[PDB]
Design an enzyme around this catalytic site. Structure first.
Site, PDB file in Angstrom:
ATOM      1  N   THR A  93      -0.835  -2.457  17.010  1.00 21.82           N
ATOM      2  CA  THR A  93      -1.947  -3.156  16.384  1.00 21.82           C
ATOM      3  C   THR A  93      -1.958  -4.650  16.664  1.00 21.82           C
ATOM      4  O   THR A  93      -2.984  -5.297  16.425  1.00 21.82           O
ATOM      5  CB  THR A  93      -1.929  -2.940  14.862  1.00 21.82           C
ATOM      6  OG1 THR A  93      -0.887  -3.730  14.278  1.00 21.82           O
ATOM      7  CG2 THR A  93      -1.691  -1.474  14.533  1.00 21.82           C
ATOM      8  N   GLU A 139      -0.752 -12.920   1.055  1.00 24.34           N
ATOM      9  CA  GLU A 139      -2.197 -12.931   0.920  1.00 24.34           C
ATOM     10  C   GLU A 139      -2.623 -11.989  -0.202  1.00 24.34           C
ATOM     11  O   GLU A 139      -1.963 -10.979  -0.463  1.00 24.34           O
ATOM     12  CB  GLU A 139      -2.861 -12.517   2.240  1.00 24.34           C
ATOM     13  CG  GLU A 139      -2.534 -11.103   2.692  1.00 24.34           C
ATOM     14  CD  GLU A 139      -3.596 -10.112   2.278  1.00 24.34           C
ATOM     15  OE1 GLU A 139      -4.710 -10.558   1.937  1.00 24.34           O
ATOM     16  OE2 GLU A 139      -3.323  -8.894   2.298  1.00 24.34           O
ATOM     17  N   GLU A 165      26.878   8.327  -2.886  1.00 25.87           N
ATOM     18  CA  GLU A 165      27.364   9.495  -2.156  1.00 25.87           C
ATOM     19  C   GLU A 165      26.548   9.728  -0.891  1.00 25.87           C
ATOM     20  O   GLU A 165      27.108   9.980   0.186  1.00 25.87           O
ATOM     21  CB  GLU A 165      27.304  10.721  -3.066  1.00 25.87           C
ATOM     22  CG  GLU A 165      27.706  12.026  -2.416  1.00 25.87           C
ATOM     23  CD  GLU A 165      27.558  13.203  -3.362  1.00 25.87           C
ATOM     24  OE1 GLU A 165      27.138  12.987  -4.518  1.00 25.87           O
ATOM     25  OE2 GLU A 165      27.862  14.342  -2.951  1.00 25.87           O
ATOM     26  N   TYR A 217      -4.263   6.122   7.338  1.00 26.36           N
ATOM     27  CA  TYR A 217      -2.913   5.759   6.906  1.00 26.36           C
ATOM     28  C   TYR A 217      -2.583   6.321   5.533  1.00 26.36           C
ATOM     29  O   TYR A 217      -1.404   6.463   5.209  1.00 26.36           O
ATOM     30  CB  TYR A 217      -2.670   4.245   6.856  1.00 26.36           C
ATOM     31  CG  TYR A 217      -2.885   3.425   8.108  1.00 26.36           C
ATOM     32  CD1 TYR A 217      -4.146   3.193   8.618  1.00 26.36           C
ATOM     33  CD2 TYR A 217      -1.802   2.857   8.762  1.00 26.36           C
ATOM     34  CE1 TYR A 217      -4.319   2.410   9.744  1.00 26.36           C
ATOM     35  CE2 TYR A 217      -1.966   2.089   9.885  1.00 26.36           C
ATOM     36  CZ  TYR A 217      -3.226   1.869  10.378  1.00 26.36           C
ATOM     37  OH  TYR A 217      -3.391   1.098  11.507  1.00 26.36           O
ATOM     38  N   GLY A 252       6.113  -8.714   6.259  1.00 24.33           N
ATOM     39  CA  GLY A 252       7.188  -7.735   6.222  1.00 24.33           C
ATOM     40  C   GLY A 252       8.389  -8.147   7.045  1.00 24.33           C
ATOM     41  O   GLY A 252       9.497  -7.645   6.849  1.00 24.33           O
ATOM     42  N   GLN A 272       0.815  -1.212   0.000  1.00 23.84           N
ATOM     43  CA  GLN A 272       0.000   0.000   0.000  1.00 23.84           C
ATOM     44  C   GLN A 272       0.853   1.268   0.000  1.00 23.84           C
ATOM     45  O   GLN A 272       0.486   2.263  -0.647  1.00 23.84           O
ATOM     46  CB  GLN A 272      -0.966  -0.008   1.189  1.00 23.84           C
ATOM     47  CG  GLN A 272      -0.310   0.011   2.554  1.00 23.84           C
ATOM     48  CD  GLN A 272      -0.059   1.413   3.044  1.00 23.84           C
ATOM     49  OE1 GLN A 272      -0.820   2.325   2.736  1.00 23.84           O
ATOM     50  NE2 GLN A 272       1.016   1.599   3.799  1.00 23.84           N
ATOM     51  N   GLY A 280       3.795 -10.037   9.755  1.00 23.08           N
ATOM     52  CA  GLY A 280       4.360 -11.349   9.483  1.00 23.08           C
ATOM     53  C   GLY A 280       5.080 -11.410   8.149  1.00 23.08           C
ATOM     54  O   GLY A 280       6.204 -11.911   8.059  1.00 23.08           O
TER      55      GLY A 280
HETATM   56  N1  LIG Z   1       2.749   3.836   8.827  1.00 18.82           N
HETATM   57  C1  LIG Z   1       2.029   2.823   8.352  1.00 18.82           C
HETATM   58  N2  LIG Z   1       2.154   1.568   8.911  1.00 18.82           N
HETATM   59  C2  LIG Z   1       1.428   0.529   8.435  1.00 18.82           C
HETATM   60  C3  LIG Z   1       0.546   0.714   7.382  1.00 18.82           C
HETATM   61  N3  LIG Z   1      -0.040  -0.475   7.116  1.00 18.82           N
HETATM   62  C4  LIG Z   1       0.451  -1.403   7.973  1.00 18.82           C
HETATM   63  N4  LIG Z   1       1.355  -0.791   8.802  1.00 18.82           N
HETATM   64  C5  LIG Z   1       2.141  -1.424   9.877  1.00 18.82           C
HETATM   65  O1  LIG Z   1       2.086  -2.833   9.775  1.00 18.82           O
HETATM   66  C6  LIG Z   1       2.044  -3.396  11.068  1.00 18.82           C
HETATM   67  C7  LIG Z   1       1.356  -4.755  11.064  1.00 18.82           C
HETATM   68  O2  LIG Z   1       1.672  -5.493   9.903  1.00 18.82           O
HETATM   69  P1  LIG Z   1       0.474  -6.045   8.982  1.00 18.82           P
HETATM   70  O3  LIG Z   1      -0.693  -5.090   9.046  1.00 18.82           O
HETATM   71  O4  LIG Z   1       0.051  -7.409   9.463  1.00 18.82           O
HETATM   72  O5  LIG Z   1       1.028  -6.116   7.469  1.00 18.82           O
HETATM   73  P2  LIG Z   1       2.070  -7.217   6.909  1.00 18.82           P
HETATM   74  O6  LIG Z   1       3.471  -6.654   6.904  1.00 18.82           O
HETATM   75  O7  LIG Z   1       1.651  -7.630   5.520  1.00 18.82           O
HETATM   76  O8  LIG Z   1       2.025  -8.512   7.861  1.00 18.82           O
HETATM   77  P3  LIG Z   1       1.049  -9.757   7.565  1.00 18.82           P
HETATM   78  O9  LIG Z   1      -0.378  -9.280   7.464  1.00 18.82           O
HETATM   79  O10 LIG Z   1       1.158 -10.744   8.703  1.00 18.82           O
HETATM   80  O11 LIG Z   1       1.438 -10.459   6.290  1.00 18.82           O
HETATM   81  C8  LIG Z   1       1.300  -2.386  11.923  1.00 18.82           C
HETATM   82  O12 LIG Z   1       1.810  -2.363  13.235  1.00 18.82           O
HETATM   83  C9  LIG Z   1       1.551  -1.061  11.232  1.00 18.82           C
HETATM   84  O13 LIG Z   1       2.465  -0.290  11.974  1.00 18.82           O
HETATM   85  C10 LIG Z   1       0.418   1.973   6.811  1.00 18.82           C
HETATM   86  O14 LIG Z   1      -0.366   2.154   5.883  1.00 18.82           O
HETATM   87  N5  LIG Z   1       1.157   3.028   7.304  1.00 18.82           N
HETATM   88 MG   LIG Z   2       0.020  -8.982   5.512  1.00 19.97          MG
END
Ligand SMILES: Nc1nc2c(ncn2[C@@H]2O[C@H](COP(=O)(O)OP(=O)(O)OP(=O)(O)O)[C@@H](O)[C@H]2O)c(=O)[nH]1
Ligand SMILES: [Mg+2]
Ligand SMILES: CC(=O)O[C@H]1C(=O)[C@@]2(C)[C@H]([C@H](OC(=O)c3ccccc3)[C@]3(O)C[C@H](OC(=O)[C@H](O)[C@@H](NC(=O)c4ccccc4)c4ccccc4)C(C)=C1C3(C)C)[C@]1(OC(C)=O)CO[C@@H]1C[C@@H]2O
Ligand SMILES: CC(=O)O[C@H]1C(=O)[C@@]2(C)[C@H]([C@H](OC(=O)c3ccccc3)[C@]3(O)C[C@H](OC(=O)[C@H](O)[C@@H](NC(=O)c4ccccc4)c4ccccc4)C(C)=C1C3(C)C)[C@]1(OC(C)=O)CO[C@@H]1C[C@@H]2O
Ligand SMILES: Nc1nc2c(ncn2[C@@H]2O[C@H](COP(=O)(O)OP(=O)(O)OP(=O)(O)O)[C@@H](O)[C@H]2O)c(=O)[nH]1
Ligand SMILES: Nc1nc2c(ncn2[C@@H]2O[C@H](COP(=O)(O)OP(=O)(O)O)[C@@H](O)[C@H]2O)c(=O)[nH]1
Ligand SMILES: Nc1nc2c(ncn2[C@@H]2O[C@H](COP(=O)(O)OP(=O)(O)O)[C@@H](O)[C@H]2O)c(=O)[nH]1
Ligand SMILES: [Mg+2]
Lengths: 426, 430, 426, 430
Positions: free
Chosen positions: B172, B64, B247, B217, B139, B15, B137
């Protein structure tokens, strides 16, 4: 006839050299397309000094443009006089040096030194009687300081007898734009002292001081600093491109100006300098040119000459003037200010006068000075080096290029040796 | 020339990519369909075909499909190469374990395949811009698997890390520190310069500066995109002092392991507020060091600055930059480490910031990108380490990580590594 | 040739000096833009005395404008002849002195003394044969009295042999506009007596008395007082800018006019002076000029000469006149009024005559007098000082600047010493 | 150059600011929107941006929002920087205690933050013009907290004090002397020159001179604004004898603790009355010393003058000033202390007074600002000290001050300090 071959290194070097090319093309009356458009034949006899005669009576400058990035080449070719340059001397890499001296001197510029040497050699063989090489570069960053010293060493090796004069814009504490400048300056002056017969030290801060406190410009851009550099660039070689009563080419300056072989980092300056609204009121007489010329505000480095003693000063005047007042000011300056000039060497001034003044100017004066006060920038560079040397930062980006600690140590030792010699005679 | 391959992992990564490319197509003037109505300023980010179409060099990887096949339905469904945006079958369950061993294993080979087919047209590939979240998970696990193979297949290429980091208070998920700690080996060993993003600090930013009471967000994204574009500004447009991506990271990094700088952007200001200020270079320079403008909830006044990089863009004169930094070094409240009395790296670009039509950010003739490493950021890890203890002391949720093929001691190596990093960022401050 | 370098201090000093510049530019026929527009060559030979020759046959006055506020500089540059001045001699601070002598002499003016000295030195070296410095300032307030004495001391230190003449408007009880004037006057005359070779005392009250009781002006503004000052300003230096039968430059006056080294605070005056409706009826003959000249109403200080004895009087006449009547009036005045002139020194008058009268005037007479009655202002200043000295007011605004009580005590002691010497010979 | 930061504390401060800026925008010709239709005469009070907008350097601080968010609704809602006008959540309850320790504590840090961001553009900052009321809870407590930190962060800068002082008879609250007495430490220690304002005396002024039977406080404000503008007249416009703000206070102050001068303005006269008088310099000079024109209900004929400052403006010739002051020193009814036989400081400005279109003041070619210190003003404190005894003798309302964190003995230090001030203003009169 005393051909002089120009080399540009780094973005600083090639842009200031390009603006120098613009200035002296106007002085010689050369059209942007390269054709001749001057008024008198005096602009025409010594065209061979800077330009090559070609078909159609058009003239191509003897310049070799060297860089590690194509963006600066793109800007210069698209600049006001980009079309006059040789497409072949645009010798350049693709990946930049990243302001890394080791990159330019070992990896990035070492592959391009072969492609610059085959061009500089052809330019030199195109000359009738080569006199030297005027090279423009920057001690800041890793392109101009990095590959510039390497190719300077190479040309000195294969041209051992020709004059080697370099104009070097060098780092400064308060107007520093890059973190890793002192490494670059220390690794560059190491080769500059050993190889160069001549080095002009240019500091950006004093260029700023000139453009505010003398020129009164509210927004003097980087091109104005380039202009201030190019003024002395054109002045120092005036005598061997135009007639004058006292002819003093580069080696004429050299034999008079550097008492010991290693004391060859010098102090450039130029007069007259006025604001737009004050030139209308100024009397441009030669004595006033002199009183402006030895002012600490007219110089292009932060090293204030009152903190040292002048070893030798060169005043290459220009214009239709007599010369008894020239001698009288050149003796009055060193008599009333004898405490600022080494009394042990009596006549510290070399006088040169040219008959044709710059276009739009009735007269002009170019300042070249050997002062022991120039060690102010050297010892300060050494001190800043020590503040980032003594316990190991940033060295992984040099040692990753094959660079080694002991060479840094020898570079610092050589900076200390230099500042020692220049304090010795103060 | 000067190409960069952008990686987008997890929901947050994909996103934030959707917002970044939304900004890039506008600033470089590409329609959502990929066409150019009417310089090679796009070669850094977009590839060109014969029919006059701009194809981004980006991969959306999510274990997913929901977010990515939502992208397949959005306005940018035709902008992207459809099978360079890779979807899995099973979600990552906020678990590093399956994402690093179980579910990402079958999909990573296609991801590197697409990375190779993105690398082979890049003639001057500069580096990688991978986006993810620590707590997620995907990320965590998939990025951990991916930088490992990228560091051996593209070892020379720089790998910039833009990651979203948990807040001291806002969270979260309960398992977020578990995912965050096993990410630390990746940034230390398989990253060249990591940029950490805190949601609560930037929540405060949008609350105070943008005057908006109710952003999403998407508002966070439409400023992370600005920070990344400003970091990439010198590579795509002309500037008086263009800073190469190599650089840049050479100027940030004092030691190979100290490569974790903070980021701030100025001027973050609403449209109603842009009118009453002249918005000089000095005040955007002064606003960046203000702890109320930091992207991570840590007080820079609690720490010491090592490297400072002034990434200006727009109608900024470098003299004003020098005048501003003289004032910056004048005050004592901003004390730099005894490493850097030179202090500041300056980068100026001629392109003014590009405004999102639906954004909450004002149109300003000048914009500055602030990236600085400091020892105060260890506090953002100094609460996460005590946090991780507070779960690991019973083995709080490890049976899932154990059940998905993780060694139990990998947590031990994880907190040993974070302790080593925390120490490393303290000795350099003396 | 006897160049004279002018310095302006304080708003009073720089505005009255600017109006003096206007007057003598009209006398020398200088256009507001600086070009020459005079009628005869007589205006042209001694241009070097006050103005510098420049390109285009335009002439820039040798004046250094010194102040601690930019507002007065703004007014003077926007004044009738603002454009003729040097942009460089506008040397000024930003924060004012607040009528504080200590501020100007220690903190506010001490930082600007370096920027005034480098200008006065260049002006002096621009001269062919420097004669002295004419400095305009005010004893009131802390700018003119404060920094004026400091830079006077500096120029006296580095120019020990040149003539030092100052024209000082000084405080008064009934037309006082500032509370803290007496401190300033006492701290200023302390340096004026020790350093200055010449001081002209000007009191505002007697300027008012001239403009009402002699000039019959209903609304004489501050510029009219400036005009009355500038008349004698131009008169005292007439002999070395124009030919005359009896040439008497500044040092000619000095050798005749100050019997002992410290008795050098003098009494200026000028004739003729008429109202608009009475000049039509007056016979401007030299004897009538004399009868007007020694009148107590023609003088520019409240010190009535009938309360003392004249030590020396200088009458620099001007115009195409013979001189036997000059001698006969100069002997009749000191014979019939021998009780008002020291009988112990017989011929108290120095006579000088110039051949070219002022523009619009057939003749003119300038009065300079040494009377023991001038102690009237000094002892009154000392008494007013005591009324604000003996038990400690306002000293926190001086002692906060590093000023100290004992120096105030020595200043008062020196005022008492002066009034003692001037009462001694009465 | 010559900038001054104006502080506005409490309801009285913010509304007197609303009237002052109403006068300033008219006299300098700025629309209520901040624009200039068509010299740098505004640089003393207003800042300039790129778009041609005049932004005042002023802070409105009130612990309660009603008056300030009323300003957010008035015609000057767009003139001011919205978040340089600071509002609290809890009113000061006419209590110095909470305003100095409890409620102003959480808001003062933002106030000094905005003061710093107002100071950093002032290249020639001259001094501070803070407005409040003694009797008010905010104007007492928050000002007491604020000058304390301003005196250590801007110790060199002058701090002029324009305060509204209770009447001998007219009063709006019973706790007013309590608030007034704890203010006395601030003016003595953290003020350079204080200007005291009495409502009943100026009530008599508008009753007798303006012929208006029914004015409001807005009429009071549209003359306090004139007095402050006349004090600042020399800094903003040209004059034959311009008096610097430092020059001014050096001329007022005989000793560091004697810096409490009275103020009067002339000619205070209605439009119907301006016609039948020539209104010479002499009569406006004579009208100022008349006890029926004093701003504080004290008889100058009961006391002795120390310092006299003639702040003329308009079409006034300094010769007429000298002629007037000769008559002033001629009469014996006006006896000056044996300190000042020189008596008078003279300041002349070329700008005629600017008339408020809705005001009750006439248009006059000449205006004079009278500021003088005298020993008679101690009577205005000689009833307040006996007043404070009349409450403190039972501990009348102290349980609130005690309950909000004030030491009980702070009242003892307070009346000890006022007694010291009262003595200090008596010995100098001998
Ligand atoms: N700043 C910011 N953080 C985000 C945003 N979307 C998700 N996050 C961060 O992502 C964290 C949780 O990870 P997930 O929502 O599960 O996303 P993911 O990395 O795909 O992990 P999985 O769903 O398990 O595959 C949250 O604590 C947020 O801080 C966003 O649009 N902006
Ligand atoms: Mg995810
Ligand atoms: C109307 C008039 O008299 O204006 C003059 C002029 O004398 C002034 C304003 C010129 C002017 O220069 C500048 O404004 C300037 C700005 C930034 C940096 C340097 C200069 C002038 O532009 C510069 C120009 O000088 C030249 O042409 C010389 O030949 C010079 N060449 C250039 O400056 C140049 C400009 C554009 C393109 C190419 C060359 C030169 C000097 C030394 C050696 C070789 C050449 C002149 C006479 C003027 C103007 C036009 C205003 C000055 O320039 C020089 C180099 O003499 C600035 O101070 C000097 C003296 C004067 O004040
Ligand atoms: C028609 C006519 O005869 O009028 C005369 C004139 O003689 C009178 C009115 C002039 C006139 O002067 C004044 O009105 C005046 C007002 C205020 C202060 C001083 C003078 C005159 O303005 C002044 C002017 O004098 C000069 O021009 C001298 O050279 C004088 N320069 C100036 O006054 C001057 C005026 C404007 C700008 C620059 C200079 C001077 C005196 C001494 C040394 C150097 C120069 C003259 C002859 C006249 C008028 C025009 C009415 C007087 O002035 C002088 C200085 O001689 C005032 O009393 C004298 C004698 C006369 O009464
Ligand atoms: N002259 C004058 N005095 C005013 C004005 N407004 C308020 N005051 C004074 O303010 C005093 C009382 O203070 P408050 O009205 O409570 O205002 P405040 O300073 O904000 O105090 P708090 O309301 O407790 O926060 C009164 O005695 C008045 O003398 C005004 O418009 N003109
Ligand atoms: N005087 C002057 N200085 C410049 C100019 N352009 C850049 N500089 C400064 O000079 C230094 C030289 O470093 P740089 O040339 O960029 O390093 P390089 O890329 O390795 O050659 C930089 O840090 C700039 O701040 C110019 O036009 N004139
Ligand atoms: N004769 C004369 N006196 C003046 C003039 N202007 C001001 N004065 C008076 O001279 C005094 C000098 O003080 P001032 O110059 O203001 O002090 P400073 O600012 O420290 O130099 C003042 O008190 C004025 O009243 C003028 O033009 N002519
Ligand atoms: Mg209130």
């Amino acid at each position: 006839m005393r051909e002089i071959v120009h080399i540009q290194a780094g973005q600083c070097g090639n842009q200031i050299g390009a603006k120098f090319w613009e200035v002296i093309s106007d002085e010689h009356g050369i059209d942007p397309t390269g054709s001749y458009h001057g008024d008198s034949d005096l602009q025409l006899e010594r065209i061979n000094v800077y330009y090559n005669e070609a078909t159609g009576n058009k003239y191509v400058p003897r310049a070799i443009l060297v860089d590690l990035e194509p963006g600066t080449m793109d800007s210069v070719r698209s600049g006001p006089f980009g079309q006059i340059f040789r497409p072949d001397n645009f010798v350049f890499g693709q990946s930049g040096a990243g302001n890394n001296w080791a990159k330019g001197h070992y990896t990035e510029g070492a592959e391009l030194v072969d492609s610059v040497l085959d061009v500089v050699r052809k330019e030199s063989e195109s000359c009738d009687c080569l006199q030297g090489f005027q090279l423009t570069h920057s001690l800041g960053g890793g392109t101009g300081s990095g590959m510039g010293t390497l190719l300077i060493s190479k040309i000195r090796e294969e041209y051992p007898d020709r004059i080697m004069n370099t104009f070097s814009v060098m780092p400064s504490p308060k107007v520093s734009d890059t973190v890793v400048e002192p490494y670059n300056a220390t690794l560059s002056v190491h080769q500059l002292v050993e190889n160069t017969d001549e080095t002009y030290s240019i500091d950006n801060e004093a260029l700023y001081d000139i453009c505010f406190r003398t020129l009164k410009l509210t927004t003097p851009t980087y091109g104005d600093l380039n202009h201030l550099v190019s003024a002395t660039m054109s002045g120092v070689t005036t005598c061997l491109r135009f007639p004058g009563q006292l002819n003093a080419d580069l080696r004429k300056l050299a034999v008079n100006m550097v008492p010991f072989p290693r004391l060859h980092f010098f102090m450039p300056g130029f007069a007259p300098l006025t604001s737009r609204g004050s030139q209308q009121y100024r009397a441009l007489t030669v004595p006033e040119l002199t009183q402006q010329m030895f002012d600490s505000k007219n110089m292009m480095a932060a090293c204030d000459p009152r903190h040292g003693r002048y070893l030798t000063v060169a005043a290459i005047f220009r214009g239709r003037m007599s010369m008894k007042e020239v001698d009288e000011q050149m003796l009055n300056v060193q008599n009333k200010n004898s405490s600022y000039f080494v009394e042990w060497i009596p006549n510290n001034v070399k006088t040169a006068v040219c008959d044709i003044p710059p276009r739009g100017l009735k007269m002009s004066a170019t300042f070249i000075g050997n002062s022991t006060a120039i060690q102010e920038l050297f010892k300060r560079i050494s001190e800043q080096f020590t503040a980032m040397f003594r316990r190991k930062a940033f060295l992984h980006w040099y040692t990753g290029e094959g660079m080694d600690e002991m060479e840094f140590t020898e570079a610092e030792s050589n900076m200390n040796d230099l500042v020692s010699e220049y304090q010795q005679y103060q | 020339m000067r190409e960069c391959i952008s990686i987008h992992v997890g929901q947050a990564g994909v996103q934030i990519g959707n917002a970044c490319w939304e900004l890039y197509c506008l600033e470089h003037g590409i329609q959502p369909d990929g066409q150019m109505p009417s310089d090679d300023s796009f070669n850094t980010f977009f590839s060109e075909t014969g029919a006059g179409k701009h194809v981004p060099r980006a991969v959306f990887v999510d274990l997913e499909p929901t977010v990515i096949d939502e992208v397949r339905t959005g306005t940018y469904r035709q902008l992207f190469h459809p099978e360079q945006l890779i979807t899995g079958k099973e979600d990552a369950a906020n678990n590093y374990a399956r994402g690093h061993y179980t579910i990402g294993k079958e999909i990573i080979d296609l991801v590197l395949d697409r990375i190779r087919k993105l690398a082979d047209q890049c003639t001057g590939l500069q580096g990688f811009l991978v986006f993810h979240s620590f707590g997620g998970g995907t990320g965590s696990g998939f990025t951990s698997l991916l930088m490992e193979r990228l560091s051996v297949d593209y070892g020379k290429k720089s790998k910039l890390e833009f990651s979203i980091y948990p807040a001291p208070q806002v969270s979260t998920a309960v398992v977020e520190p578990y995912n965050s700690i096993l990410t630390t080996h990746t940034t230390l060993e398989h990253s060249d310069c990591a940029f950490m993003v805190d949601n609560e600090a930037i929540y405060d930013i949008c609350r105070r500066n943008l005057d908006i009471e109710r952003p999403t967000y998407t508002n966070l994204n439409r400023l992370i995109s600005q920070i990344v574009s400003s970091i990439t500004a010198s590579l795509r447009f002309d500037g008086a002092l263009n800073v190469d991506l190599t650089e840049f990271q050479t100027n940030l990094v004092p030691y190979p392991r100290i490569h974790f700088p903070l980021a701030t952007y100025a001027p973050v200001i609403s449209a109603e507020k842009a009118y009453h200020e002249q918005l000089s270079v000095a005040e955007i320079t002064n606003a960046c060091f203000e702890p109320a403008n930091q992207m991570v909830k840590c007080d820079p006044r609690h720490g010491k600055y090592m490297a400072c990089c002034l990434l200006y863009r727009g109608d900024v004169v470098p003299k004003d930059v020098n005048a501003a930094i003289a004032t910056i070094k004048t005050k004592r409240s901003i004390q730099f480490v005894d490493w850097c009395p030179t202090g500041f790296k300056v980068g100026i670009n001629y392109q003014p910031p590009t405004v999102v039509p639906g954004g909450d950010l004002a149109k300003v003739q000048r914009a500055v990108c602030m990236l600085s490493n400091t020892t105060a950021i260890a506090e953002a890890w100094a609460r996460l380490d005590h946090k991780f203890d507070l779960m690991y002391a019973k083995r709080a949720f490890v049976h899932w990580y154990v059940g998905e093929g993780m060694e139990e001691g990998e947590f031990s190596e994880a907190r040993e590594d974070m302790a080593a990093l925390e120490k490393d960022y303290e000795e350099v401050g003396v």
